[PDB]
Symmetry: C2
Subunit: 142 residues, 2 copies
């Protein structure tokens, strides 16, 4: 990516779930970057990177190009354009940062890891269901 601008770079409380392992609430670092892909006729790229200060090998990355976003928009029922999408993600992440144990409904950030792949979601838990506000697939590494 060229002229890659970081829009968001903060720790986020995440419920890290994994096969055969205990769920753990960890402060993970999220970096959200936007840029244009020189090598791909200046396609705009949205990049989200998850890392852990305490584990150099804990790496998860999502890259959504403008063309990827057309499919994502349909599957997730997203109603805004590509340029407005990062800001909506940021607002959801803030709800997770600010969420308290007591309030209801409650916003949680969840990262389920499984076999060289993982699924990040932000859910709203009310009295009778877990409402996913966003669901994103991440790949291992940078």
């Amino acid at each position: 990516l060229s002229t890659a601008t970081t829009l968001f770079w903060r720790p986020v409380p995440v419920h890290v779930k994994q096969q055969d392992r205990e769920d753990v609430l960890e402060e993970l670092t999220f970096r959200i970057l936007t840029g244009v892909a020189k090598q791909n006729h200046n396609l705009r790229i949205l990049r989200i990177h998850i890392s852990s200060d305490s584990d150099l090998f804990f790496l998860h990355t999502l890259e959504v190009s403008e063309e990827d976003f057309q499919s994502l928009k349909n599957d997730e029922g997203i109603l805004v354009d590509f340029a407005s999408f990062p800001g909506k993600i940021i607002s959801l992440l803030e709800k997770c940062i600010l969420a308290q144990p007591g309030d209801s409904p409650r916003f949680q950030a969840v990262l389920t890891i499984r076999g060289g792949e993982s699924v990040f979601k932000i859910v709203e838990i009310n009295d009778w269901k877990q409402l996913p506000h966003i669901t994103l697939a991440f790949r291992p590494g940078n």
Copy 2:
């Protein structure tokens, strides 16, 4: 259904989506029943029927057995048992009934017809996303 109890039987505002046609806000009649099917090992069944008082043939039907609910519960992240499920659906339908065009967020009933059959859902629409509280597939007719 023999010992069948009707829990709900009234008009509800619904947004109908057809392939080669325009979206339309119609008053559709919803009937929700619970009972047992002698035809199916006396399993407990939830039956939902959609109709129209202006079109004799506009008919859509869903039947969910207590066995089917196990897979549905996981796909929809439902946190209550089968017995409590219809009440939550009814609660969602009431919100669609009481909703107003200028609300934010807005609860909205949607019936998408495709290839004959249809997909019904109740969404919570905010500034950027359709939050599906429930999604259900219906069959044409009674």
